[PDB]
Structure formats: structure tokens, C-alpha cells
Design an enzyme around this catalytic site. Structure first.
Site, PDB file in Angstrom:
ATOM      1  N   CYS A  42       7.389  41.804   4.211  1.00 58.70           N
ATOM      2  CA  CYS A  42       6.951  40.458   3.850  1.00 58.70           C
ATOM      3  C   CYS A  42       5.476  40.425   3.463  1.00 58.70           C
ATOM      4  CB  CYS A  42       7.220  39.512   5.017  1.00 58.70           C
ATOM      5  SG  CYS A  42       6.799  37.784   4.739  1.00 58.70           S
ATOM      6  N   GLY A 114       9.829  56.040  15.080  1.00 54.10           N
ATOM      7  CA  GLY A 114      10.514  56.164  16.357  1.00 54.10           C
ATOM      8  C   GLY A 114      11.981  56.522  16.195  1.00 54.10           C
ATOM      9  N   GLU A 202      24.471  38.161 -12.881  1.00 54.61           N
ATOM     10  CA  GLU A 202      24.983  37.798 -11.565  1.00 54.61           C
ATOM     11  C   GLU A 202      26.496  37.947 -11.560  1.00 54.61           C
ATOM     12  OE1 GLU A 202      23.760  37.075  -8.562  1.00 54.61           O
ATOM     13  OE2 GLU A 202      25.831  36.845  -7.868  1.00 54.61           O
ATOM     14  N   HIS A 444       3.339   6.596   0.723  1.00 57.29           N
ATOM     15  CA  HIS A 444       3.472   6.362  -0.706  1.00 57.29           C
ATOM     16  C   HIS A 444       2.169   6.689  -1.427  1.00 57.29           C
ATOM     17  CE1 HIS A 444       4.578   4.354  -4.509  1.00 57.29           C
ATOM     18  NE2 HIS A 444       3.332   3.918  -4.497  1.00 57.29           N
TER      19      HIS A 444
HETATM   20  C1  LIG Z   1      -6.929   2.188  -7.176  1.00 62.38           C
HETATM   21  C2  LIG Z   1      -5.961   1.945  -6.047  1.00 62.38           C
HETATM   22  C3  LIG Z   1      -5.182   2.997  -5.579  1.00 62.38           C
HETATM   23  C4  LIG Z   1      -4.276   2.814  -4.535  1.00 62.38           C
HETATM   24  N1  LIG Z   1      -3.520   3.894  -4.109  1.00 62.38           N
HETATM   25  C5  LIG Z   1      -2.679   3.705  -3.131  1.00 62.38           C
HETATM   26  C6  LIG Z   1      -1.885   4.833  -2.686  1.00 62.38           C
HETATM   27  O1  LIG Z   1      -1.934   5.972  -3.144  1.00 62.38           O
HETATM   28  N2  LIG Z   1      -1.024   4.539  -1.647  1.00 62.38           N
HETATM   29  C7  LIG Z   1      -0.876   3.302  -1.043  1.00 62.38           C
HETATM   30  O2  LIG Z   1      -0.060   3.185  -0.123  1.00 62.38           O
HETATM   31  N3  LIG Z   1      -1.624   2.245  -1.473  1.00 62.38           N
HETATM   32  C8  LIG Z   1      -2.477   2.448  -2.460  1.00 62.38           C
HETATM   33  N4  LIG Z   1      -3.238   1.391  -2.888  1.00 62.38           N
HETATM   34  C9  LIG Z   1      -3.047   0.087  -2.241  1.00 62.38           C
HETATM   35  C10 LIG Z   1      -1.840  -0.661  -2.787  1.00 62.38           C
HETATM   36  O3  LIG Z   1      -2.079  -1.054  -4.139  1.00 62.38           O
HETATM   37  C11 LIG Z   1      -1.581  -1.905  -1.941  1.00 62.38           C
HETATM   38  O4  LIG Z   1      -1.532  -1.538  -0.567  1.00 62.38           O
HETATM   39  C12 LIG Z   1      -0.266  -2.589  -2.310  1.00 62.38           C
HETATM   40  O5  LIG Z   1      -0.285  -2.908  -3.702  1.00 62.38           O
HETATM   41  C13 LIG Z   1      -0.013  -3.839  -1.499  1.00 62.38           C
HETATM   42  O6  LIG Z   1       1.189  -4.471  -1.981  1.00 62.38           O
HETATM   43  P1  LIG Z   1       1.420  -6.014  -1.809  1.00 62.38           P
HETATM   44  O7  LIG Z   1       2.807  -6.386  -2.342  1.00 62.38           O
HETATM   45  O8  LIG Z   1       1.143  -6.382  -0.409  1.00 62.38           O
HETATM   46  O9  LIG Z   1       0.326  -6.660  -2.758  1.00 62.38           O
HETATM   47  P2  LIG Z   1       0.116  -6.387  -4.306  1.00 62.38           P
HETATM   48  O10 LIG Z   1       0.664  -5.060  -4.669  1.00 62.38           O
HETATM   49  O11 LIG Z   1      -1.373  -6.591  -4.603  1.00 62.38           O
HETATM   50  O12 LIG Z   1       0.943  -7.534  -4.992  1.00 62.38           O
HETATM   51  C14 LIG Z   1       0.553  -8.918  -4.866  1.00 62.38           C
HETATM   52  C15 LIG Z   1       1.075  -9.676  -6.060  1.00 62.38           C
HETATM   53  O13 LIG Z   1       1.145 -11.080  -5.739  1.00 62.38           O
HETATM   54  C16 LIG Z   1       0.841 -11.815  -6.895  1.00 62.38           C
HETATM   55  N5  LIG Z   1       0.418 -13.152  -6.488  1.00 62.38           N
HETATM   56  C17 LIG Z   1      -0.728 -13.494  -5.818  1.00 62.38           C
HETATM   57  N6  LIG Z   1      -0.840 -14.779  -5.577  1.00 62.38           N
HETATM   58  C18 LIG Z   1       0.315 -15.319  -6.124  1.00 62.38           C
HETATM   59  C19 LIG Z   1       0.804 -16.637  -6.202  1.00 62.38           C
HETATM   60  N7  LIG Z   1       0.164 -17.700  -5.707  1.00 62.38           N
HETATM   61  N8  LIG Z   1       1.993 -16.831  -6.814  1.00 62.38           N
HETATM   62  C20 LIG Z   1       2.642 -15.776  -7.314  1.00 62.38           C
HETATM   63  N9  LIG Z   1       2.277 -14.491  -7.299  1.00 62.38           N
HETATM   64  C21 LIG Z   1       1.100 -14.327  -6.686  1.00 62.38           C
HETATM   65  C22 LIG Z   1      -0.228 -11.000  -7.614  1.00 62.38           C
HETATM   66  O14 LIG Z   1      -0.222 -11.284  -9.009  1.00 62.38           O
HETATM   67  C23 LIG Z   1       0.217  -9.557  -7.325  1.00 62.38           C
HETATM   68  O15 LIG Z   1       0.973  -9.005  -8.397  1.00 62.38           O
HETATM   69  C24 LIG Z   1      -4.156   1.545  -3.949  1.00 62.38           C
HETATM   70  C25 LIG Z   1      -4.935   0.492  -4.414  1.00 62.38           C
HETATM   71  C26 LIG Z   1      -5.837   0.676  -5.454  1.00 62.38           C
HETATM   72  C27 LIG Z   1      -6.663  -0.492  -5.929  1.00 62.38           C
HETATM   73  C1  LIG Z   2      10.115  40.478  -2.995  1.00 59.97           C
HETATM   74  C2  LIG Z   2      10.482  39.811  -1.696  1.00 59.97           C
HETATM   75  C3  LIG Z   2      10.086  38.496  -1.467  1.00 59.97           C
HETATM   76  C4  LIG Z   2      10.409  37.845  -0.276  1.00 59.97           C
HETATM   77  N1  LIG Z   2       9.989  36.537  -0.097  1.00 59.97           N
HETATM   78  C5  LIG Z   2      10.297  35.943   1.024  1.00 59.97           C
HETATM   79  C6  LIG Z   2       9.861  34.574   1.213  1.00 59.97           C
HETATM   80  O1  LIG Z   2       9.213  33.907   0.409  1.00 59.97           O
HETATM   81  N2  LIG Z   2      10.236  34.028   2.427  1.00 59.97           N
HETATM   82  C7  LIG Z   2      10.960  34.671   3.416  1.00 59.97           C
HETATM   83  O2  LIG Z   2      11.223  34.056   4.455  1.00 59.97           O
HETATM   84  N3  LIG Z   2      11.369  35.959   3.225  1.00 59.97           N
HETATM   85  C8  LIG Z   2      11.050  36.552   2.088  1.00 59.97           C
HETATM   86  N4  LIG Z   2      11.467  37.844   1.890  1.00 59.97           N
HETATM   87  C9  LIG Z   2      12.223  38.505   2.960  1.00 59.97           C
HETATM   88  C10 LIG Z   2      11.315  39.066   4.047  1.00 59.97           C
HETATM   89  O3  LIG Z   2      10.484  40.093   3.507  1.00 59.97           O
HETATM   90  C11 LIG Z   2      12.168  39.647   5.172  1.00 59.97           C
HETATM   91  O4  LIG Z   2      13.073  38.651   5.635  1.00 59.97           O
HETATM   92  C12 LIG Z   2      11.322  40.110   6.354  1.00 59.97           C
HETATM   93  O5  LIG Z   2      10.322  41.015   5.884  1.00 59.97           O
HETATM   94  C13 LIG Z   2      12.148  40.769   7.434  1.00 59.97           C
HETATM   95  O6  LIG Z   2      11.287  41.096   8.543  1.00 59.97           O
HETATM   96  P1  LIG Z   2      11.696  42.189   9.593  1.00 59.97           P
HETATM   97  O7  LIG Z   2      10.565  42.336  10.616  1.00 59.97           O
HETATM   98  O8  LIG Z   2      13.044  41.862  10.119  1.00 59.97           O
HETATM   99  O9  LIG Z   2      11.763  43.520   8.728  1.00 59.97           O
HETATM  100  P2  LIG Z   2      10.618  44.100   7.798  1.00 59.97           P
HETATM  101  O10 LIG Z   2       9.671  43.021   7.418  1.00 59.97           O
HETATM  102  O11 LIG Z   2      11.297  44.845   6.648  1.00 59.97           O
HETATM  103  O12 LIG Z   2       9.900  45.133   8.720  1.00 59.97           O
HETATM  104  C14 LIG Z   2      10.599  46.283   9.239  1.00 59.97           C
HETATM  105  C15 LIG Z   2       9.590  47.363   9.529  1.00 59.97           C
HETATM  106  O13 LIG Z   2      10.181  48.335  10.415  1.00 59.97           O
HETATM  107  C16 LIG Z   2       9.674  49.600  10.084  1.00 59.97           C
HETATM  108  N5  LIG Z   2      10.601  50.607  10.591  1.00 59.97           N
HETATM  109  C17 LIG Z   2      11.850  50.904  10.114  1.00 59.97           C
HETATM  110  N6  LIG Z   2      12.462  51.856  10.777  1.00 59.97           N
HETATM  111  C18 LIG Z   2      11.552  52.207  11.764  1.00 59.97           C
HETATM  112  C19 LIG Z   2      11.594  53.158  12.802  1.00 59.97           C
HETATM  113  N7  LIG Z   2      12.631  53.969  13.026  1.00 59.97           N
HETATM  114  N8  LIG Z   2      10.516  53.251  13.612  1.00 59.97           N
HETATM  115  C20 LIG Z   2       9.472  52.446  13.395  1.00 59.97           C
HETATM  116  N9  LIG Z   2       9.323  51.513  12.452  1.00 59.97           N
HETATM  117  C21 LIG Z   2      10.404  51.442  11.664  1.00 59.97           C
HETATM  118  C22 LIG Z   2       9.518  49.585   8.567  1.00 59.97           C
HETATM  119  O14 LIG Z   2       8.515  50.508   8.159  1.00 59.97           O
HETATM  120  C23 LIG Z   2       9.102  48.129   8.297  1.00 59.97           C
HETATM  121  O15 LIG Z   2       7.694  47.984   8.140  1.00 59.97           O
HETATM  122  C24 LIG Z   2      11.147  38.530   0.699  1.00 59.97           C
HETATM  123  C25 LIG Z   2      11.542  39.844   0.474  1.00 59.97           C
HETATM  124  C26 LIG Z   2      11.221  40.492  -0.713  1.00 59.97           C
HETATM  125  C27 LIG Z   2      11.671  41.916  -0.918  1.00 59.97           C
END
Ligand SMILES: Cc1cc2nc3c(=O)[nH]c(=O)nc-3n(C[C@H](O)[C@H](O)[C@H](O)COP(=O)(O)OP(=O)(O)OC[C@H]3O[C@@H](n4cnc5c(N)ncnc54)[C@H](O)[C@@H]3O)c2cc1C
Ligand SMILES: Cc1cc2nc3c(=O)[nH]c(=O)nc-3n(C[C@H](O)[C@H](O)[C@H](O)COP(=O)(O)OP(=O)(O)OC[C@H]3O[C@@H](n4cnc5c(N)ncnc54)[C@H](O)[C@@H]3O)c2cc1C
Ligand SMILES: Cc1cc(S(=O)(=O)N(C)CC(=O)Nc2ccn(C)c(=O)c2)c2[nH]ncc2c1
Ligand SMILES: Cc1cc(S(=O)(=O)N(C)CC(=O)Nc2ccn(C)c(=O)c2)c2[nH]ncc2c1
Lengths: 465, 465
Positions: A42, A114, A202, A444
Site C-alpha cells: 500500500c 520469516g 474484462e 449546504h
Molecule cells: C455571499 C453569500 C454566501 C452565502 N453562502 C452560504 C453558504 O455557503 N451556506 C449557507 O448555508 N448559507 C450561505 N449564505 C447564507 C444564506 O444565503 C442564508 O442563510 C439563506 O439564504 C437564508 O434563507 P431564508 O429563506 O431564511 O432567507 P432568504 O434566502 O434571504 O430569502 C428571503 C426572501 O424573502 C423575500 N421577502 C422578504 N420580505 C418579503 C415580503 N414582505 N413579502 C414577500 N417576500 C419577501 C426576499 O425577497 C427573499 O427572496 C450565504 C450568504 C451570502 C450573502
Molecule cells: C496499485 C494498487 C493500489 C491500491 N490502492 C488501494 C487503495 O486506494 N485503497 C485500499 O484500501 N487498498 C488499495 N490497494 C490494496 C492494498 O495495497 C492492500 O489491501 C494492502 O496492502 C494489504 O495489506 P497487508 O498488510 O494485508 O499486505 P501487504 O500490504 O501486501 O503487506 C504484506 C507484507 O508482508 C511481507 N511478507 C510476505 N511474506 C513474508 C514473510 N514470509 N516474512 C516476512 N514478511 C513477509 C511482504 O514483503 C509485504 O511487505 C491497492 C493495491 C495496489 C496494488
């Protein structure tokens, strides 16, 4: 030499070194034996480096396809050598972290290979020359798995595994990938974005066949739109390396066809490592599919020997290995533990873009196991964040049992969806139903809002769709 | 005109139109009154277009500052006009979706401005000229809030609020932002990445003063390294617009200074809309801070009138307005509902780079209120995916009660952490402790793994740190 330990871990992959850490935390004298890869596949040639390359590939993807949409101007090239360089630096840093963790927990590192002499003795061939005998009250096997080759084929200069490919700083002009699992699809995504002609073959009728069928078709379309040729329900019969080109012969509906590329990648599966280190002399029984057999506590037929990670073949993933290592260590110490149960309920992700992420049963599996299934599907076209990032594709699909609304599975495809599984797996573990999930307010705007809308659909009607 | 409805909603923001949807699903005849913004501030000039611009700014940072690290042969150019165009396109698309949801749920749209005549009558000045007299069994006030200005200052050609700025296609050469809240910081991040000289002034001694103190220090460092000038514990005394320049006089420690820029953005706060539509004729009581008072079920002092969203001032966020709308509708219908209780426990996020995401109490607040606190902090330098994506900055910090490990708050800063909150708030609301959370397996390699490690730290010792 000679020594004795409460716990000896064989293999320093994610399963092994985490198993050793937990054992050390529980007050057990612990050693870990590894000759090559600290952090295993691994960290050295697997998860860690491949995800750095996938990130680089993602940026190529954004520029080559969405430059106009994002108002980007300029003439630039992407150097894969720099991508490769960064993946090696990221891998080496985490390998160092493993050594830091061993020392922090006062775990003895044994650098060698081993071999079991008996059920309580291990002979180690040391890297720096020499031999050592280590005895133990308990052993944790964590030896990993190896690449399974297409029957009849062999490796050569132009036929490789993930290992030789991920360690290559230069790329070929064309490649044929055998296997449309997560590994094959991830390599196909990287190489294609960097200008390689990619064909993926495959045997099963869907790419990513372990996933829900709806996820397969979405990813196939995305990859085809990316320019990747995908041949499903197609069997690889032979691979002939001719130095100047590799000829792959395939069959579909009785018809044979020859494909040609500069290189071939074998990525059809992984076989547990069970030969060459004395599993017989220790008395460890294998399953019919040649994996080390274990019970819910990762215990073999020998009570004081455990097998964790890819070697037991349950679910060959890094986080699964770590978890199995914790269960094993806590079982050895008589500590309070929790068994993983049905490993199909564990999470998994594929890190091409769009990501794929899932846990539990597909819709088809849930119905085939007698559940009264309810399904809710929310497309990211109805998600504010997905439009903000410029990727409204994909969906969230949740499967639940109609009786109480308990989650049976979840299947996501979309931008960075891999980060969205924790809420789903937590609820499944601790018997939280859709009616409780639907009350959890999601921030969100986020992709995670799609999960909440699916909860509304399982218990009633969606609000924003 | 003379019509009667079971439920009339005033304002079509996230709170109003979701409340209308829930009322319709519950079989209530529902109308909604809006004169200007369907989707409110959020969809037209708030959350939705803002996060499109922040995506564009994120890509500018990746493709300019990190060009050579990702192997890009040069630094490409980003045209802000195109970023503006995409933000308006995204906003329009979601506004059309609100109209779709109103029609799908058979909700009656009333296009005009509503004014209360008595506690059961609404006089609507219709946009098309006429007037309509709407009576109702219940009313839901969702009128939002408006920008607070620095005392004694005035809006002018070069002194604007969020609304005028986000609707500008051309950027100034320099700007001074009054207020280091989430809105001020996000605009600062967008404008700075597109070449504007940005100065942010904040009266309180921390940027993002509502977040945990540790989060404020990290984000101040990142913004300063990005080139943004941040002046905290600094008070704005006057704003003088002189056409070709704006002079902002500020004071810190009894020492005055004049800041000069081309434009000034006022983003110090938002005041509930309570004037000009007859709240006095309906008898709705206001709080001491001039918000509509409500109880746990969003009821005003008038039993059949409710207030949701920013107009009640509890927590001015979109997902908060939606949840309050669901509570109001379900209470009116007599259906099963769940009050939000302590709004400090709800999640929130800021979508600059790095993201900031939090819920619940800060460490300072938890101790201040008598809890016996335990804290676990995990840095993303120890996370495999963070290095893979190229951003290992930030951390995850969890605050829990030491009696049983119940979560009191969580505070994250880093790459994409906005998506990681669902697991935390789910556990807090259904009383899952650090012991249960620690058993939830997290996919590898993800940012969410840092969550699991924090669970380990609260219950015992971390594994990968
Ligand atoms: C730049 C920016 C990035 C953001 N990014 C995230 C984020 O990644 N994740 C996250 O969780 N939050 C984020 N937020 C916050 C998110 O926008 C607010 O938490 C969310 O919009 C609140 O939803 P709400 O329905 O309570 O109010 P709003 O989404 O503001 O909706 C209120 C609506 O009510 C309407 N309204 C108001 N008064 C009246 C009325 N008298 N009659 C009818 N309609 C009316 C308005 O026109 C408006 O459309 C971000 C905010 C900003 C400014
Ligand atoms: C290209 C590739 C990509 C992979 N990607 C992933 C991945 O993204 N995620 C994932 O979960 N798995 C992945 N795997 C699988 C992962 O490598 C194996 O599941 C994992 O290495 C198994 O661990 P292990 O300890 O059981 O054996 P190994 O990791 O193979 O270790 C066994 C060790 O025992 C030693 N050994 C053997 N015989 C003896 C002995 N008699 N005395 C002493 N030492 C000995 C060997 O030298 C070896 O180093 C991938 C495998 C490959 C080939
Ligand atoms: C399989 C796996 C790998 C990594 S890991 O590859 O990131 N890693 C091995 C952890 C690491 O490096 N820890 C440290 C700690 C302190 N100091 C000083 C270090 O130098 C390094 C995971 N992280 N989280 C979860 C996780 C899971
Ligand atoms: C505050 C808010 C806004 C949006 S939203 O701005 O994405 N939106 C208003 C939803 C939307 O547009 N739905 C549809 C459905 C069908 N058809 C055909 C459409 O055209 C549009 C949210 N989505 N999820 C959660 C959420 C929350």
C-alpha cells in the site's frame, strides 16, 4: 541468534504494523518481521503512490476537457516524470512514518524473511546476512497477496504487473489492461490522461463488476468519453510478447480477435501469499480457494496464530487489514473487541474521477437474499455543490429494508464521493434507521446533501427532487 | 382577488420553499409569496454562485502556485469574466429547479410583496400591478435578513455589499473588506486569486471569530501566505468614497490609520428583515436584538404564525432555514417532528481553501460551560490522502465529554473537510460516544481517516499518530 516475544507479526503492511501497534498499546512484547516493504504494498507501490498519480491525472483531465468552461487560457504540457517523482516522494515520506510509529511504540523491527519451524518458532533469514530464531506465544500472519496472472501467460519485458508499471517513469504509446477492477480502471485513468492509448479487457459483463450495476454503466460511459476502449464479456486467451509489440488474443461470443499494443498490464486479481514460509510446519489450514482460513476473530485452526489482511482473502483492502489487525491484537490480550461480521458491509472506494464509493449489498444482492428492499436514488444534477465544482454527474443510491428502514447498502458515483461513506457505515453498525438519518442536518452546499435527500426518499418523499 | 390557504409562506428562500414543500407533502393547501428571488439570497446571490466562484479560485491556486510541483510546463491564465458567467449560469439553473419543485408539489406561487393586514390576512402588491388579499389558517414568515453597515457609513459607487460585488463581472485593482466572517474571507479568497490587492479588517481579535481559536490561527496563516493582508482587533471609524479611491480610517490600540483602495466591501453582519410588511398589524413580537422571537417549534407569540430562516437570527445558514421550515410545517400539520434544540450543535462550513468545517462547542466554550473536556487533534500531515492531493495542511479537532465520550463539538480545517461533518452530527444527536465511533471503519486513503484517528485519541491512543 535467539529471542522470544509475546506477539510476532509476519509482514509490515497496513495490517501488520497496525496490529503490532495495537498489541504494543495493550502491553504485549511485540516484534514485526519484514524484508522489503515497510508499509507493505500500500505505502510503497500501492494506495499511497497511486493516489498521488491519480491527483496529477485529474488536473490533466480538468485542463484538457474543461479549460473553456473554467475560462482557462494558455499553452502548457504535463510532464509525467514529475508526476512519478512526486509519487515516490509521497511514498517515501509515509514509509518513514511507519518507522516512526514502530519506534514510538517500542516495537522490535526484524529485517528479514520469516519461515515457520513449528507452531511457536520462526526462523528469520536476515537482510544484513545471518539467521535468527524467534519464538512466540502468539503469531499474526500478514503476508499479503501477489498478482494473479492470466492462465497460460507469463511476465516479460512488455508484460508487467502493477509493481513494474507504477515504478516506471516513462510511459508507452499504447497499453492493454487485463481486468476492469479498481486497479485496472485507476491505471487506465492515469495513463489515458497522459496520452497513452488504453484498452481495458474484462471477462465479466461489466466494468467494476463488484459494484452496483448502475455504477458500472456510469463509469463505463465516463471512461469511454475519456477515450478509453472498454471490452466487457471478453476473455483473454493468450499474450505473445514480441519485443517490438505485444499481441493479445481475445474471444467474445466464440469469435477470436487479436489486439496489439506496446505493453500489457496484468490486473485480474490477487492471490494470498501462502507458499514458501512453512505454513505446513505450523499446521495452518487453507481454504478451498487457497487463502488462510480464519474465524470472526482472525484466528486460524491453530488458536494462537492469526491471519489478517489480504492473506485471508476476505476483502483485500488496506483499511480492512488495519481493522482485522486490531481485532486480532485485542483478542490476544483478552481485551474488549468488536468483530467485523459480514465483510460485505465494509466500505470501499475507487479514486478515478468521478470517484466510486460503496458499502454493503447491491440492490440485486439485497433482493436475492430475501430482503423487502426499498431504494432511493438522487442524481447530482439536483445538487448545488456538484454544479459549483463543475461536475454534476453521478448519483447516490441507497438500499434499505422496508420493515424498519435499516440500511443494507449504499452506492455512490461522483466527484470526491469517497469521503461520504462514514455516516452510512456508522448507522449500519449501530442500528440507526432512515427515519433517524433523515433528521441529521447536512451542511449546504455539499455533496453530502445528496445523502440526506436519499434518507427522505427511504422514509417518504424527497424534498429537493 | 380573494383566496384562502391552509398555509401561506412569506419569502421563497431555502426556508420558505422547503417549508412549502413539506406542507404540501402533508396535504395542506399551500401558497408562497415572493417578489424578487425564487430560491432567495442563497440561490440568486449567495451560496450557489459563491461556491462556483470559489471553485474557479481553487483552480487558479492549483494551476498557478503549484504549477511546477504538479509538472505543468507553465502557468495558465484564468479569465474572471468567464468565472462570473458560469456562476450566473449555475444560479439560473437552480432557480429554475425551485419553480419545478413548486409545480411538482402543486404549490401556488404568488408573485408580489406581502404585507400583513391582521393576524390572518396578507395584502400582496403583485408584481404585475394589481393587489391580492390572502387569508390563511397558518403563516410562515421566511423573509430573510439584510446587510448591516458600519455605523455612520453609507453605500456608494465604490462602497458595496455582497450583492453588488457578486454581480460584478469586472474586478477592482484593490479592495478593503470590512468583516472577517465567512463571507468576507470567501470574497477575499476569490478576489486575491484573481489578482486583486485584498485587505480584510476585523473588529474582533480573530479572523473567523466564531470558529475554534486553533482554526482561526491556521486560516490566518494560510490567507497571509496567499498574500492577503489581515488586520484584526481593528475598528473601522469612517469610510470616505472619493470616486477614484476610497479612504477607510481604522483604529487599533488608540492609534488611527487611513487605508486606501479602489473599492470597499461591507460584510460585518446581517440584520433580520422585520420592517415594512406589517409585523405590527399581526402582533408578532421581536427580541431585544430585533429578530422575530420563536420557541422550539418556530412559533411566534401568535400561535398560528411561524418564523424560520435568517429572520429569527438563531443561525443564519441555508440548511438551518430548511430544517426550521420542516419543523414549522410538521408542527402545523400535527405530524411527528424533531426540534433542533441547541442551534450551536448544527454544522457549518466555509468554502475557501483550506475549507473550514465545524459543529457544536469550541474547546473554549465547552470548558467555559462546566463540561469535563477531552480533546483529540490529528494533523493532516499524518494523513495519506492529504499528501496525495497536494495539501497536507490543517487538522481535525474533536471535543468530547469525559464521562461517557459524548461529542460536544468538532472543528476541521483542511482539504474538502466540509464534507466530513455528517458522521459527527449523527453521533451527537443519537448519543453515540467515542467508543462506538472508534469502531466505524473509514475507507483508505481518505481525509475522513483523520476522523477515526481522533476517535481513537478520545478513547485511548491514536494508531497512526
Ligand atoms: C455571499 C453569500 C454566501 C452565502 N453562502 C452560504 C453558504 O455557503 N451556506 C449557507 O448555508 N448559507 C450561505 N449564505 C447564507 C444564506 O444565503 C442564508 O442563510 C439563506 O439564504 C437564508 O434563507 P431564508 O429563506 O431564511 O432567507 P432568504 O434566502 O434571504 O430569502 C428571503 C426572501 O424573502 C423575500 N421577502 C422578504 N420580505 C418579503 C415580503 N414582505 N413579502 C414577500 N417576500 C419577501 C426576499 O425577497 C427573499 O427572496 C450565504 C450568504 C451570502 C450573502
Ligand atoms: C496499485 C494498487 C493500489 C491500491 N490502492 C488501494 C487503495 O486506494 N485503497 C485500499 O484500501 N487498498 C488499495 N490497494 C490494496 C492494498 O495495497 C492492500 O489491501 C494492502 O496492502 C494489504 O495489506 P497487508 O498488510 O494485508 O499486505 P501487504 O500490504 O501486501 O503487506 C504484506 C507484507 O508482508 C511481507 N511478507 C510476505 N511474506 C513474508 C514473510 N514470509 N516474512 C516476512 N514478511 C513477509 C511482504 O514483503 C509485504 O511487505 C491497492 C493495491 C495496489 C496494488
Ligand atoms: C494505512 C494507513 C497509512 C497512513 S500514513 O501513510 O499516513 N502513515 C503511515 C501515518 C504516519 O505517517 N504517521 C506519522 C505520525 C507522526 N510522524 C512524526 C510521522 O512522521 C508519521 C495513515 N494515516 N492515517 C491513517 C492511515 C492508514
Ligand atoms: C438549498 C438547497 C438547494 C438545492 S438546488 O439548488 O440544487 N435545488 C433547488 C434542487 C433542484 O434544483 N432540484 C431539481 C429537481 C428536479 N429537476 C427537474 C430540476 O430541474 C431541479 C439543493 N439540492 N439538494 C439539496 C439542496 C438544498
Amino acid at each position: 541468534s535467539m529471542t522470544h516475544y509475546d506477539v510476532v507479526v509476519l509482514g509490515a503492511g497496513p495490517g501488520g504494523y497496525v496490529a503490532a501497534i495495537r498489541a504494543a498499546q495493550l502491553g504485549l512484547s511485540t516484534a514485526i518481521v519484514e524484508p522489503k516493504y515497510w508499509g507493505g504494498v500500500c505505502l510503497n507501490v500501492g494506495c499511497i503512490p497511486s493516489k498521488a498519480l491519480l491527483r496529477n491525472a485529474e488536473l490533466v483531465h480538468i485542463f484538457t476537457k474543461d479549460a473553456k468552461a473554467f475560462g482557462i487560457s494558455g499553452e502548457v504540457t504535463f510532464d509525467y516524470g514529475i508526476a512519478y517523482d512526486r509519487s515516490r516522494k509521497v511514498a517515501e515520506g509515509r514509509v518513514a512514518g511507519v518507522h516512526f510509529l514502530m519506534k514510538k511504540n517500542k516495537i522490535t523491527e526484524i529485517h528479514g524473511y520469516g519461515t515457520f519451524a513449528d507452531a511457536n518458532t520462526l526462523l528469520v533469514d536476515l537482510n544484513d546476512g545471518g539467521t535468527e530464531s524467534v519464538t512466540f506465544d502468539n503469531a499474526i500472519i500478514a503476508t499479503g497477496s501477489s498478482t494473479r496472472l492470466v492462465p497460460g501467460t507469463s511476465l516479460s519485458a512488455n508484460v508487467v504487473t502493477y509493481e513494474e508499471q507504477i515504478l516506471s517513469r516513462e510511459l508507452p504509446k499504447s497499453i492493454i489492461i487485463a481486468g476492469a477492477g479498481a486497479i485496472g480502471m485507476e491505471f487506465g485513468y492515469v495513463l489515458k490522461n497522459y496520452g497513452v492509448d488504453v484498452t481495458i479487457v474484462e471477462f465479466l459483463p461489466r466494468a467494476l463488476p463488484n459494484e452496483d450495476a448502475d455504477v458500472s454503466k456510469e463509469i463505463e460511459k465516463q471512461f469511454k468519453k475519456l477515450g478509453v476502449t472498454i471490452l466487457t464479456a471478453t476473455k483473454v486467451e493468450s499474450i505473445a510478447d514480441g519485443g517490438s509489440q505485444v499481441t493479445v488474443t481475445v474471444t467474445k461470443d466464440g469469435v477470436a480477435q487479436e489486439l496489439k499494443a506496446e505493453k500489457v498490464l496484468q490486473a485480474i486479481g490477487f492471490a494470498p501469499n501462502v507458499e514458501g514460509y512453512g505454513l505446513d510446519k505450523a499446521g495452518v489450514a487453507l481454504t478451498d480457494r487457497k487463502a488462510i482460513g480464519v474465524d470472526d476473530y482472525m484466528r486460524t485452526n491453530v488458536g494462537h496464530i492469526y491471519a489478517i489482511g489480504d492473506v485471508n482473502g476476505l476483502l483485500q483492502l488496506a483499511h480492512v487489514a488495519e481493522a482485522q489487525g486490531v481485532v486480532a491484537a485485542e483478542t490476544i490480550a483478552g481485551a474488549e473487541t468488536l468483530t467485523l461480521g459480514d465483510h460485505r458491509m465494509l466500505p470501499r472506494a475507487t479514486f478515478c474521477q468521478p470517484n466510486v464509493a460503496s458499502f454493503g449489498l447491491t440492490e440485486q444482492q439485497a433482493r436475492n437474499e430475501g430482503y423487502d428492499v426499498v431504494v432511493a436514488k438522487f442524481p447530482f444534477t439536483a445538487n448545488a455543490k456538484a454544479h459549483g465544482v463543475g461536475d454534476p454527474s453521478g448519483f447516490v443510491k441507497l438500499v434499505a429494508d422496508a420493515k424498519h428502514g435499516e440500511l443494507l447498502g449504499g452506492h455512490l458515483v461522483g466527484h470526491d464521493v469517497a469521503e461520504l461513506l462514514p455516516e452510512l457505515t456508522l448507522a449500519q453498525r449501530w442500528d440507526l434507521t432512515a427515519s433517524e438519518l433523515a433528521r441529521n442536518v447536512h451542511t449546504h452546499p455539499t455533496m453530502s446533501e445528496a445523502l440526506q435527500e436519499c434518507f427522505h426518499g427511504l422514509v417518504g418523499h424527497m424534498i429537493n427532487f
